[PDB]
Swiss-Prot record, chain A:
Residues of the full protein shown: 180 to 529 of 529
GO MF annotations in UniProt: DNA binding; identical protein binding; single-stranded DNA binding; zinc ion binding
Subunit details: Homomultimerizes on viral ssDNA bound to pTP. Forms a initiation complex with viral polymerase, pTP and hosts NFIA and POU2F1/OCT1. Interacts with host SRCAP.
GO annotations of cellular component type: host cell nucleus; viral capsid
Source organism of the structure: Human adenovirus C serotype 5
Protein name, as recorded: DNA-binding protein
Ligand binding (Zn(2+) 1): 105, 107, 118, 128
Keyword Kinase part of the UniProt annotation: no
Domains: entry comment: The C-terminal arm bridges DBP molecules together, thereby creating a chain.
Region (C-terminal arm, DBP binding): 270-286
Family, as annotated: Belongs to the adenoviridae E2A DNA-binding protein family.
Organism lineage: Viruses, Varidnaviria, Bamfordvirae, Preplasmiviricota, Tectiliviricetes
Gene name, Swiss-Prot/TrEMBL: DBP
UniProt binding sites for Zn(2+) 2: 169, 171, 218, 224
Alphabetically ordered keywords of this record: DNA replication, DNA-binding, Early protein, Host nucleus, Host-virus interaction, Metal-binding, Phosphoprotein, Viral DNA replication, Zinc
């Protein structure tokens, strides 16, 4: 029902006063996100001025929101597009937080070696792109997110083992290099010197117990300024859920794909010939 | 001795008629400062309804009195709690009144000029911005700032002429209503205010007339709160509680406010820590 979501969308665009220009061209097409991001930015500025982001670009934050909102409107109106997932993310079952010292790449193969890399990198060829300079700092980052998710979702059936990772950056919208956004582990310096027996906020306790964050950046840091931390991405989902419920009450079913490895994600080394347009009917003259 | 302080606490709460609810649950815990702030407010109304406060919130004066009172009660009962300092204050031996034109941030080091003065670890930072090794100290007017330190020294001299040691220290609050983590300053912002009317007129009053400026301790970052109190008033808040005690108990127990020694926990935090967001869903993802 294209009309349904088409309308529910303009309502939000009216309420949060989006430029009639942006407001007029939106037709709920596969990748019209600017308007929805506009709605989310105005909402944030209104009901959430105290939003602090840790290792995340503000522009990236409101863009992810737009993607998650586009997902909901589509899921609400029951609108599908043959080859387009709105969120642009996927759920990776990161088994990096179980056996200590044992990290794993997108392939499902244990990272091989202080440093760690994709088995097929003993990066190029049939690799995924995952490399870690300091393996220790990496597992800390994966443990932290596992903690954060349990603090946020205390008693849940599943979810703590997955990782809401983005599949596309501002570029994936073929090219050489990594096909997925790079995930570089960052360290939390100040968190390292706080007494763990602090305030009852368990989400903050996660960072304190594991001072490192998984930060997703552009596939190849063409490239772009895409930057966003794991927890901030999760917040981006939760906040859009809030926004939705605040206006429509019931949250429609919106499923974000479970990541399954395939050759299409492989690190691309050689290019493929692309044709340069020619304003000629015939190739040669003779 | 918990029971010893409980008896003494009950007395004060009875005499100064504290609300039944408040004084009922009171167990002398480190966070229970409400009842003690009450005892003080009463005593102020029915004993000093003519108190004046220059650049100070009456709410803050009561809160501070409650702390100092708690401190005395604990000293009297010989009860200390790990991870708790009742006064929420520290004695800073600032050397901002020794050499003319020379100030010194909470590090014990001189201050770089920008007439503005800033912490040396902000040498690379633009004027008012703070680095991660900063103490958060900054003064637009270095001169005025020293005048504020000169006034507090003089005030302290007037009140204690034959004081052996103590004239070089500064009683200052280490925690506002907020830190009692967050970005920015980790200690109340020390801002110097000018006493305009002082320029046109007992020793205490001579202090403000000779050095027309006052040190004001606001919130760490003006989370946020309405914490406001001047240096002399804070000193008074201490003195008054001492009275309230003497007037009610024969002896005054020893109470030592800790001496400020710079440490890592006080440096300006620029990077934040991820805080969750309330989601009314058991499961995080829809499968
Ligand atoms: Zn791999
Ligand atoms: Zn990119
Ligand atoms: Zn300093
Ligand atoms: Zn405050």
């Amino acid at each position: 029902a294209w009309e349904k979501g088409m309308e529910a969308a303009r309502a939000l665009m009216d309420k949060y006063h989006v430029d009639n220009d942006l407001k007029a061209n939106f037709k709920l097409l596969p990748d019209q996100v600017e308007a929805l991001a506009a709605v989310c930015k105005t909402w944030l500025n209104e009901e959430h001025r105290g939003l602090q982001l840790t290792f995340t670009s503000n522009k990236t934050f409101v863009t992810m929101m737009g993607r998650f909102l586009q997902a909901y409107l589509q899921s609400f109106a029951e609108v599908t597009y043959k080859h387009h997932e709105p969120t642009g993310c996927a759920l990776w079952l990161h088994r990096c937080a179980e056996i200590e010292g044992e990290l794993k790449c997108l392939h499902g193969s244990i990272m091989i070696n202080d440093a760690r890399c994709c088995v097929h990198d003993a990066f190029s060829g049939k690799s995924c792109g995952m490399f870690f300079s300091e393996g220790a700092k990496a597992q800390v980052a994966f443990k932290q997110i596992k903690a954060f998710m349990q603090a946020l979702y205390p008693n849940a059936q599943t979810g703590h083992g997955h990782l809401l990772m983005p599949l596309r950056c501002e570029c994936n919208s073929p090219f050489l290099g990594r096909q997925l956004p790079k995930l570089t582990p960052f360290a939390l310096s100040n968190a390292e010197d706080l007494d763990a027996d602090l305030i009852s906020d368990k989400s903050v306790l996660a960072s304190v117990h594991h001072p490192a964050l998984i930060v997703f950046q552009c596939c190849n840091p063409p490239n772009c300024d895409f930057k966003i931390s794991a927890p901030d991405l999760l917040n981006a989902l939760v906040m859009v859920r809030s926004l939705w419920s605040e206006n429509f009450t019931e949250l429609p079913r919106m499923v974000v794909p479970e990541f399954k490895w395939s050759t299409k994600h492989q690190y691309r080394n050689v290019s493929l010939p692309v044709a340069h347009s020619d304003a000629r009917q015939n190739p040669f003259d003779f």
